Design an enzyme around this catalytic site. Structure first.
Site, short mmCIF file in Angstrom:
data_model
loop_
_atom_site.label_atom_id
_atom_site.label_comp_id
_atom_site.label_asym_id
_atom_site.label_seq_id
_atom_site.Cartn_x
_atom_site.Cartn_y
_atom_site.Cartn_z
N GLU A 116 0.81 -1.21 0.00
CA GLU A 116 0.00 0.00 0.00
C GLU A 116 0.85 1.27 0.00
O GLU A 116 1.06 1.88 1.06
CB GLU A 116 -0.99 0.00 1.19
CG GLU A 116 -2.14 -0.97 1.02
CD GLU A 116 -3.17 -0.93 2.12
OE1 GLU A 116 -2.93 -0.29 3.16
OE2 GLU A 116 -4.24 -1.54 1.95
N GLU A 128 -5.90 -7.40 -1.03
CA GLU A 128 -6.33 -7.18 0.37
C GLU A 128 -7.68 -6.49 0.39
O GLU A 128 -7.81 -5.37 -0.09
CB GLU A 128 -5.31 -6.32 1.11
CG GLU A 128 -5.42 -6.31 2.64
CD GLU A 128 -4.44 -5.33 3.25
OE1 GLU A 128 -3.22 -5.61 3.27
OE2 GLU A 128 -4.87 -4.26 3.71
#
Ligand code: CL
EC number: 3.2.1.4
Length: 328
Positions: free
Chosen positions: A137, A239
């Protein structure tokens, strides 16, 4: 049941009637569905054979993601054993260089990524089981990964040296690249995609913090996914949670239904967060549930959180009929 590496072989991006999608060695569309570990520093006990056996066999996962936060360099060892346990349990395995803080996959503290990826790749040369995820991320926390093209370009400059290096030694693995705003911007790559026929783009969502549709409009994340898809990119959801973006709250299961319909109808592979027994709504296991279910044993449904139970049914593709949670 979604297809295992034993029957799917090498994964590659294929094109059918003008549309690109994740495919297998036979040239058929395939979907990967599985679970992500929590941070392997905080929850390493999931890296056990009985667990990986249960997820592959009972939950019918064809993928597991090893979230290595970047603590000790000894964390690298649990990744290796996890890769080993996944191959041995007939599952694809995502090797996740799990950037989060700082948000910049470049910024000093993440020095050894290419080095790390080099090691794993050398230990497992062109192994069909492994999927490389280069930066979990990318995000603005203590970084200059901005929510725009310039932010995407920094991510791209980070990813390319690692990709080239991997390709040079003959590694033809799927590589998944994250993107700005906590991997909610696969659309930014449309502006300047990676010139690699086996690179995919991450999208992340939490069903308590993001809807496919709101007030008549496609939500930001879902539309960013759509934009990447319409423009010839492929998306892999490395995710997502049933909770809010904190990892807690809910779960939000009606919203999960809508997300999963949206993903399945587009053949987007997905990995649920997480394989923890933390006391938070996204964790798949109750706080009193062991992350080793025992030799020849699976976790019982009542050992699973409301989220864990739901995701298990969806990974399997069976109807969701939740158990009674009260008895006297
Ligand atoms: Cl259902």
């Amino acid at each position: 049941m979604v297809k295992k590496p034993s029957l799917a072989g090498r994964l590659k991006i294929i094109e059918i009637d003008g549309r690109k999608t994740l495919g297998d060695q036979h040239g058929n569309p395939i979907q990967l569905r599985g679970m992500s570990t929590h941070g392997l520093q905080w929850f390493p006990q999931i890296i056990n054979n009985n667990a990986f056996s249960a997820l592959s066999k009972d939950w019918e996962a064809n993928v597991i993601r090893l979230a290595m936060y970047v603590t000790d360099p000894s964390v690298k060892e649990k990744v290796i054993e996890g890769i080993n346990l996944a191959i041995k349990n007939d599952m694809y395995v995502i090797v996740d260089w799990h950037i989060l803080n700082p948000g910049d996959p470049n910024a000093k503290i993440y020095s050894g990524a290419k080095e790390f990826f080099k090691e794993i790749a050398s230990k497992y040369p062109n192994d069909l089981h492994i999927i490389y995820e280069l930066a979990n991320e990318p995000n603005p926390t203590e970084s200059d990964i901005t929510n725009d093209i310039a932010g995407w370009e920094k991510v791209k400059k980070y990813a390319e040296p690692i990709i080239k290096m991997l390709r040079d030694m003959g590694n033809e693995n799927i590589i998944i690249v994250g993107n700005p705003e906590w991997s909610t911007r696969p659309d930014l790559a449309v502006n300047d995609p990676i010139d690699d026929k086996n690179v995919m783009y991450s999208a992340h969502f939490y069903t308590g913090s993001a809807s496919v549709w709101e007030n008549g409009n496609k939500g930001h994340i879902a539309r960013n996914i759509e934009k990447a898809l319409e423009n010839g990119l492929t998306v892999f959801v490395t995710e997502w949670g049933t909770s809010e973006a904190s990892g807690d709250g809910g779960p939000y299961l009606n919203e999960a239904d809508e997300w999963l319909e949206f993903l399945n109808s587009n053949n987007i592979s997905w990995v649920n967060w997480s394989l923890a027994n933390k006391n938070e709504a996204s964790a798949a296991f109750l706080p009193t549930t062991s992350l080793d279910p025992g030799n020849g044993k699976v976790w019982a449904v009542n050992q699973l959180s409301l989220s864990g139970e739901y995701v298990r049914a969806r990974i399997k593709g069976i109807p969701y009929k939740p158990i009674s949670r009260e008895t006297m």
